Amino acid sequence: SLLNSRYKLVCYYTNWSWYRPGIGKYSPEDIDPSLCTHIVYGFAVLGNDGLMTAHDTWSDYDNRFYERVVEYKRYGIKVSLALGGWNDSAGDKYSKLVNDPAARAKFVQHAVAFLEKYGFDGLDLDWEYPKCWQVDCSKGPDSDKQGFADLVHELSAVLKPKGLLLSAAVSPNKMVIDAGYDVPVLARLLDWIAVMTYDYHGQWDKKTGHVAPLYYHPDDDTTYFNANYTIHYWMEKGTPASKIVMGMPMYGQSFTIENRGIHGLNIPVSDGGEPGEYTRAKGFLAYYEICDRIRNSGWTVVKDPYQRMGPYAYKGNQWVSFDDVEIIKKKVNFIKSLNLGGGMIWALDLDDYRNRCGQGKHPLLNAIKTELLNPKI
Ligand SMILES: Nc1c(C(=O)NC[C@@H]2CCCO2)cc2c(=O)n3ccccc3nc2[n+]1Cc1ccco1
Ligand SMILES: *[C@@H]1O[C@H](CO)[C@@H](O)[C@H](O)[C@H]1NC(C)=O
Hints:
binds 2-acetamido-2-deoxy-beta-D-glucopyranose, Group II chitinase
């Protein structure tokens, strides 16, 4: 089993996946406890008073979603609560917090009490990102780095004596890593660092690209927008391999291409792809939306024979890049080869947990688990 293996498999749960129609609805009891060593609940948010608070009281509290996910401790899974996320990182509120020692001190004691009230095993920090707020490095002060490092120390100093876990989800981008993270401090204090080795490319690039390349590709604009560079860079900056879990996407980035006629990488794009009927977000498709388009709507799939990145698929002016089982196995062999702490997925509710595509339930996540448990590298 994963729990008895040397690897973690950190699974993100999202409370908002409840608000999806038909088979896209996901609830706490849809979690498969054989597929995760750790579950991280996304998300709590930073309140206006500088204290962690529930994002969705109707689900988190009134419908006991926190309790229903903390339920999985009964299987030996560690269940943490994540603070932040992309949407909660839009403004200056996390920067204001971390740059204020008195505000940090108030936040830390309340946060630990919050975790203990609901039975969580730890806190996961998901500020995206210190200094580079929503990736814009011009927005925040350099002191976000020291402030975040001190927040991590102050949290660790309270959580660790209580046997509670502290982790962070972190950027894969060299410039954001350089600007936002005191890597030795984080590496020493955090129980794991979930490197978000995805969203390297998307509609914001104005051209097609892969959500999550593993290795450099000769046509890349940079040498650093791939998981191999990112993971080695976290280690070069001072992170032990055992502290790293490598993120893998259960979704794709979608694009509306300017011209039906060319359908390859790095081709001009006019907008995000049309929203999926379940996830309802321009530029984003769950794996179970992508596999259905391939299986039943005739989308054409292009694979990389050198397996530096997963496939992309297209039809008409729609184009999506994503990870299939084949590239997932390659990525997990990469995790094992570097002796990393394990793997991480964003997110449980985006894999084909209903077996809509006939590959079996949870095809991507089961591929990760099987490869992690395979002793050969
Ligand atoms: N919203 C987002 C999101 C996102 O976290 N979740 C989407 C949700 C989540 C659940 C359901 O689908 C991530 C990124 C991102 O990693 N970026 C990286 C580098 C540069 C820009 C950028 N922008 C992002 N944006 C804005 C965006 C761009 C175009 C349209 O929106
Ligand atoms: C992965 O990265 C390392 C260090 O950056 C590099 O030496 C190696 O060649 C890369 N692997 C590739 C490009 O397949």
